[PDB]
From a paper:
The eukaryotic replisome, organized around the Cdc45-[name]-GINS ([name]) helicase, orchestrates chromosome replication. [name] is a two-tiered ring composed of six related subunits ([name]–7), with one tier of amino-terminal domains (N tier) and a second tier of carboxy-terminal AAA+ domains that power ATP-dependent DNA unwinding (C tier). Multiple factors associate directly with [name], including Ctf4 and the heterotrimeric fork protection complex (Csm3/Tof1 and Mrc1), which has important roles including aiding normal replication rates and stabilizing stalled forks.
We observe two major conformations for the [name] C tier (termed conformations 1 and 2) where the whole C tier swings beneath the N tier, with some inter-subunit motion between adjacent C tier AAA+ domains. Despite the presence of the FPC and Ctf4 in our structure, we observe two C tier configurations similar to two conformational states previously determined at lower resolution for isolated Drosophila [name] in the presence of ATP (Eickhoff et al., 2019) (conformations 1 and 2). These two states were reported to represent [name] translocation intermediates, enabling [name]-[name] contacts made during translocation to be inferred from our structures. Conformations 1 and 2 differ in ATPase site occupancy and [name] engagement by the presensor 1 (PS1) hairpin and helix 2 (H2)/helix 2 insertion (H2I) loop that protrude into the [name] central channel. In [name], the equivalent basic residue is absent whereas an arginine (R455) replaces the aromatic/hydrophobic residue. These contacts are similar between the two conformations, except [name] is disengaged in conformation 1, [name] differs in its contacts in conformation 2 as the path of [name] diverges toward the 5ʹ end, and the position of [name]/5 near the 5ʹ end and [name]/6 nearer the 3ʹ end in conformation 1 is reversed in conformation 2. The equivalent [name] basic/hydrophobic pair is disengaged from DNA in both conformations, with a unique tyrosine (Y604) instead contacting DNA in conformation 2.
Author numbering:
A (entry chain 7): 394 to 627, 630 to 730
B (entry chain 5): 348 to 415, 421 to 443, 446 to 455, 462 to 524, 544 to 556, 561 to 577, 592 to 636, 647 to 687
C (entry chain 6): 500 to 616, 620 to 785, 792 to 836
D (entry chain 3): 338 to 449, 454 to 583, 648 to 741
E (entry chain 2): 474 to 527, 532 to 583, 588 to 609, 614 to 710, 745 to 800, 804 to 868
F (entry chain 4): 500 to 607, 614 to 733, 740 to 780, 792 to 852
Write the structure that this text describes.
Amino acid sequence: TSDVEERVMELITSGDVYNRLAKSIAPEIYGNLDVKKALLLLLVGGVDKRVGDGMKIRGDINVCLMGDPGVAKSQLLKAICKISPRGVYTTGKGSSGVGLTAAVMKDPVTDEMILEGGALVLADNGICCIDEFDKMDESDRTAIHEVMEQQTISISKAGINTTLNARTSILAAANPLYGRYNPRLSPLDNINLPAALLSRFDILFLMLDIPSRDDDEKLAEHVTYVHMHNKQPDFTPVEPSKMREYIAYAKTKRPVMSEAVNDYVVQAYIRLRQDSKREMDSKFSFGQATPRTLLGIIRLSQALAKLRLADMVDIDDVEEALRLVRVSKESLYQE
Amino acid sequence: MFTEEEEEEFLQLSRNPKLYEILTNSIAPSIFGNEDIKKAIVCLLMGGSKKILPDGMRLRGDINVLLLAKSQLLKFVEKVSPIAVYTSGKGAAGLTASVQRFYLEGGAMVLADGGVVCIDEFDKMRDEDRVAIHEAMEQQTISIAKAGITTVLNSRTSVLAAANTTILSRFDMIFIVNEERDISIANHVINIHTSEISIEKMKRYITYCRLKCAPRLSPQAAEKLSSNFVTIRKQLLINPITIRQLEAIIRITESLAKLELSPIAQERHVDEAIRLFQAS
Amino acid sequence: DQEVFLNSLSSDEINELKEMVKDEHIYDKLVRSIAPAVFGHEAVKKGILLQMLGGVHKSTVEGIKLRGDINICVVGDPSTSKSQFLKYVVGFAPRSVYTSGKASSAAGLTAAVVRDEDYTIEAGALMLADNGICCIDEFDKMDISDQVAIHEAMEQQTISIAKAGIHATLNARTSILAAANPVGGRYNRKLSLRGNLNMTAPIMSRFDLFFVILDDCNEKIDTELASHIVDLHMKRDEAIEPPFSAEQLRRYIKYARTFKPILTKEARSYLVEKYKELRKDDASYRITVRQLESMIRLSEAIARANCVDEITPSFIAEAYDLLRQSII
Amino acid sequence: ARQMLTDFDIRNINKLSKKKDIFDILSQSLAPSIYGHDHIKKAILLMLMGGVEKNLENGSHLRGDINILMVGDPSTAKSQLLRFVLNTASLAIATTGRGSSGVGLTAAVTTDERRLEAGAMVLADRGVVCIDEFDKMTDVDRVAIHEVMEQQTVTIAKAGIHTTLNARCSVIAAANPVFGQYDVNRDPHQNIALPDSLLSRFDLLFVVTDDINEIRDRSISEHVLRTHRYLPPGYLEGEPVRPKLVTIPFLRKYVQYAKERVIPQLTQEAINVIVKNYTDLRNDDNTKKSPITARTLETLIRLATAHAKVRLSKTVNKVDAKVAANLLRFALLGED
Amino acid sequence: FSWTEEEEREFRKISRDRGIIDKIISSMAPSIYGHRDIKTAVACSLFGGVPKNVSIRGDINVLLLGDPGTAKSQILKYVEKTAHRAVFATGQGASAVGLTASVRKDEWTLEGGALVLADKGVCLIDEFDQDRTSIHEAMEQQSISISKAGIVTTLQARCSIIAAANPNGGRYNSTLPLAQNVSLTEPILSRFDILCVVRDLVDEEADERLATFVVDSHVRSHPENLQRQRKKEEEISPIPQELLMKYIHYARTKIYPKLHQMDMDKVSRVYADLRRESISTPITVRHLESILRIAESFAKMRLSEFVSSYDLDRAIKVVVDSFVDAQKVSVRRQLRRSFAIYTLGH
Amino acid sequence: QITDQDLAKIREVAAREDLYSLLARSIAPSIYELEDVKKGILLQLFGGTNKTFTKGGRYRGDINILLCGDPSTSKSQILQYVHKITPRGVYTSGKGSSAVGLTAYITRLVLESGALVLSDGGVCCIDEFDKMSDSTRSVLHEVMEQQTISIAKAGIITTLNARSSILASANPIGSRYNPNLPVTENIDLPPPLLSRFDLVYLVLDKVDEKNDRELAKHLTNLYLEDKPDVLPVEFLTMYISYAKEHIHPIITEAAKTELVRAYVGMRKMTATTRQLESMIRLAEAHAKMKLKNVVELEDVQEAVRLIRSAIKDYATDPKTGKIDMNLVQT
DNA sequence: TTTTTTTTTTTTTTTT
Ligand SMILES: Nc1ncnc2c1ncn2[C@@H]1O[C@H](COP(=O)(O)OP(=O)(O)NP(=O)(O)O)[C@@H](O)[C@H]1O
Ligand SMILES: Nc1ncnc2c1ncn2[C@@H]1O[C@H](COP(=O)(O)OP(=O)(O)NP(=O)(O)O)[C@@H](O)[C@H]1O
Ligand SMILES: [Mg+2]
Ligand SMILES: [Mg+2]
Ligand SMILES: [Mg+2]
Ligand SMILES: [Mg+2]
Ligand SMILES: [Mg+2]
């Protein structure tokens, strides 16, 4: 409404909204700016696209944080759960793939069975935070391939034969195999996700807890402040209800592509698949790049074009979208 | 329940200077030899003493023993005790505690209380397996947090075991091991078909001790035991025995004084205690 | 009884039967006539026929019952028409009933405890088809808790209800025709039949005939077989050409069921020797005493197929041969 | 159980808190029947005081509660010392590793239309949970504990039930190493089967061991033999039942007063010692009993806040931080 | 069923040291060849021992293992037709409720199951888990207990049990001990008064001798075939099957045999001897009471109230060799080399 | 219902030389290449002929298809296209289903239809078939082979008519196709079920920059407008529904020589008896699609060629059963 | 104020 616009115009004209918004996600957590700069794109999302030829493609963005223990994976999932207008939390061990997806209840009365939506149904037009995704049983984890790409759900049990509309975004969190990342093994041996599941993530941040005499001093000087005061240490954020009032405006803008940008994202996909062809050398392999990842660049670049409130995507938004996919992997290579 | 017309006989047993051996002679009496074995059954019938300390700590009064036709001793135990239970784990109810449909079951450890449970190939017993006996037999306690069930189950009871690793931790002492016997035994069976004390006295005597006496170590018994336990550890070091065993010695030393109805234990008891323990 | 049936037929129904009873080649024509859509496997076809003719189900002076039924299992590597037999037989025999071994239960196959105005017993397949053919498809996929529901009730006959307070018992005189794949999905020529099929050995021991099928690679067979399959799709039921029509054939089978064949002393004297050969050739697992009784049964059924009141050693040679072939 | 305080008892608690080495008076008065594990009993006292739970205005939670694991040789009072904490915490729930399944340990759905049933960690929601033989849990059970120890809420998504339950307990746990006895000639991650993600949740990891030494074994043996000579005050020789130390009902009153009526704020003077320790503890190369994560910084902040509670202090001072750092370095590195 | 005033006299008349026992053992399921050892037992299990009170069982329980198609299954079905009362319970076909007891409205009540329809006579059962554990409770003293519908009570059984087993989910096997061929706990196996195992030893001239017998029974059983029935009893038993349902009963129910203590010293001398070499590479009072039960049983079998030494020799024979099967491949020859003067060294 | 003007359009279209490619590119316009996958799923919509023998059994045009392949290859999206186009049907997944709910449920005592029985006379689409339990896969054997279900449970002992063509989507045992393992060990379905399908596809994500220059330049091209030759679907579904009931192709004797010769040439090299029964049903579907009442050599050649291409049989080594990745699309 | 299978899906602990 025009009174909402009389608020967000102060933020827009104050400027640099993309970096302010990303820093404002969990000011309680130090650093991880590149990762906040991705989880923010998971709030605005890309564009859902029906084709007049009867096909439809996903607008929800999926993101994976893979990393060492005690790095604020979970502390950060629980923040997006409060910031988003509709998010829900869940965990790997506490969850059946059934109660995560939807379930057939036997005897509520009269011994006749009925269908009840799981956490991914509640996350209708919202978020599901799947915490400790590693410790989920593979028969339970393979239940989400169905929802991460094709949007819908389907069930055929005990006289109930049904679909559920179930449109939702996934924010998973996990630790590598053997509890912490091991440089002796490949990135894939550490990640330990099957390739069709890995394919469904628009980004995999490989975030790591490498010690440093400077960087751990900078961390503790922040964190001790947040115990000495409830405040963040030192910049000023936007409060959640003002953030939602911006993001829910941005989510309306449906930014279309343009030809000189299409021509550029094509070249970037060839270079990524050529790299995947040559760099199957285990110490460097993140698996093979695929058409789901081309759509990953499209969605991540449309999300950036919403946040700047654009009419159409521009090349300045593609060179940034490619950066997040890069920096995710480079967090290992930089060591 | 005892009165003046009955307990003065228990004062007469308590006076006799060969008392302990009179009990060995009257335990599974058909089974020849086996002297230190029958002695252990006695001490398990007598027990040490329960204590509750000023800091809320509790100290276990119950002995446990490991044995290696001797089934007749464990059978005889489910006769002579004030309270007892005989099972290998034939059960098929679990020995310890086990979960069903959810709801609980108390096993033979739970079902025994004061008194005794006795178990014949404790080796081949694996019916709610050895992990559950480590709590049950050491702690007097079985614990469960399964299928929304939460409870503590008491298990305030003695264990006698026979067998044939881990459970040599939990058992306090260890022991092992003619034909004319068989001819007499068969003649007993045939005659169904076609000192000299007994259960009638001995069960009632045991419960009278159990209720009316709970000894303390004299200071001079502590001097003997402390000096002994480090002498054991010095030899063990230069060539394990640990406080888990030292406490067992103490329990034994109490039960050996308890037989006399003596209010205090002395070198007299310590010497048969550490001697019986050296039969490890 | 034969008189009741021969009073039931008309003179013109009998005058058709009269000539096929007269004919010499009749037993080889009957075998050629079963399941006309299936090519080769004459041994199987011959098996099925002898099942429909049954044996003399009989009881000793000792009150024990000696079984007359014949139990056929067809085991095979895939795409070999083991199912086409079952579907032919259900579509032909009197009191037939078909059943998948997967989509079925220990109740639905035997006796079911149910309720109506208190508890009551309902029929499963072995009740809706005594004096008839109980097919069992996919028997290898049957629940192990339920393969044993049949073990109960083939050597010992006698379904025995001891549950839901309704202690009760049923005769269930019935003949099983059971298809299966070998485990892993193709026949492991190198294994025993045990472990080619995972079943309970006692259940396997009291089957009369295991026709193992192999997809024989021979080109002179497959050039014919392919032409046979294309002819069925090209010109349908004009391409099948049996010696007898099904309604002509059932009159013969129903007639033959009314003889009760008898052993010659030659036939006895031959049978003991054919048991010796079988047993010597396992020097144990598939030649128990049950295979003797099966050989009697089969010789009676052949004698019925010939419409003869007495067992000729010729038929025992013919019965023994089916048992030999079953070994592969 | 709950104590009721009075104007007399509150005088005695306040005047006692003035004493120069009060943390040593109280830590010796826990389980005095248990000999010489002095540094374990010090950490238990801080576990009973807890810390300070912070919740930020954006809903972001910060844990307030100590968790302890002690791992060791057989027959070491490692078990016996849990069996004591259970009888001196205000609210305590007992369990063991094999005595547990991860659902019965946390929460389990039940058919009643269906309900969620509270498990052992959802009980004790402001108390303590004691786990013995922790190592005998399967990893399929130990994944249940991972959710609770940092986030302090159980959450379920089974059979159409979806919920969070609060679970703000402290855990104290005990274990054997893989080899029965601790193999001191081998690395800790090879003696201890547990993953770094679980060892990162325990604030203090006490490796405790039997070691044969004449004066040690003597002094212990004398301790227990004195113990086995106790008399309940009204009883007599051979009749069955039925340098200061505080009497434990007073200790429990002290813990209750401190846990209710003081909420320490960090001085920057303490923060400099917390930071100096965290950065050098994590960056020096000497082998630790478990890897030093960014959870360990929080352990220092909580142990110093818990000691300031023992000291009945409105502010955490350099003295508290120095005791917290010495206790943490004893646990993670080795004896001083 | 039962005998009458002429048959009374006939019984003590046909009672003869000329093998009245033997004509009985020969007569168990006459249409099964060989396997006289199993016939020996089934005779004892029919005739039973005598129970004595204070706790001694008279019932003689038996188990039949074997390598299949061996007429263990059918010798049970012969007993249902031969014992006075006896109940046949297919081992897969029963609920544990159906073995035990069940509850229904009339107002509310209880009624009994298969182990309650058994009473001194013989339960017939097969196919060796809570079902199985009910037998583990019933073995000790012949009584169930229940707590259903708040009705805390016993129910008596006091019955013998005949049991058949297929071992191993397959063949029987000589390698390993008998104890291992079946999923049965040793208390079971101690309390069975005999265990028998049957093998397919493929001797060609034994096989010949089945088949002669078998096919002849097929002739004899053909509906082509009242008085010719009298020739068609055909002496396949020496005792008319018609009489055994009387003889059994008249032993059981007129004779309650008793043991001549003068000779019982030999039983004790033997029991020690047997224990000595069993222990040289395990034998119990349950193996002694088996000798004592079966010996009373055989006096029932020669219609005598006063047990005689030949019953003890027959009984010793039945019980001794059954031990020889445990461990068999290693042990047996060693056992035979001692045992041969006892089992059959008459 | 078809009017004289509608029939005139249908008869005009059937006379075109591009027809088989025109229909194939028109069943799913937004999918790039995959021409042999479209060309076989087109034939599944028409199906073969359906035949009753007065005695000797029943046989049917229900072609079963398995899309097996590595992820992000449009297996699940072709499955969406078919489910929208089929005149009746179901879409489901291998985790979403139970054996009961896939077939029929004992309700109240009464029977309720599960997914296949809800979906006779049209395509049943199973996605994620690889993730399905062996118990649920073990129910498919009779209902693919005999077009029917048989039940024997409490009260109900019965058959059901179940004339469903299955379209299955699957993913290999290691989640991306493994060229070190042989093709049968990638697919990892049991042979009695793998043999049940009429067409088996490998779709493979082979990197080829001269191809991916076109795929990305196609796929991103959708995003140039917000709501962005071929037949209109309205007419295409009509042409299929005419040909499904007004055309029934019979086998010419000139087609038999080839059907036999081809089967012998395959079975020499396994090509079990169901390969011939599938060649018949596809060769009927191709003539049916082209509006012919007779099957000919030109049709049997495509029914063969399409089977050789679908499994990449020309790229599979003649021994070992491994595949040479250089030969795949050259 | 008290129970029996048999068919079904989802949860939970128990055994090779
Ligand atoms: N001060 C003490 N120091 C050492 N041991 C003691 C002490 N006081 C009592 N104990 C004794 O030794 C045991 C203490 O060890 P405890 O904690 O119970 O076993 P644990 O170390 O957990 N061993 P375990 O259960 O076998 O792994 C008790 O059983 C007592 O017998
Ligand atoms: N010695 C024998 N004399 C006569 N018939 C025999 C003999 N041994 C076996 N049989 C026959 O072989 C079969 C034995 O069947 P059965 O008694 O059911 O075998 P079983 O092995 O005991 N069966 P089972 O317990 O189910 O495995 C019957 O057909 C008998 O007639
Ligand atoms: Mg976390
Ligand atoms: Mg078939
Ligand atoms: Mg302990
Ligand atoms: Mg038998
Ligand atoms: Mg897909």
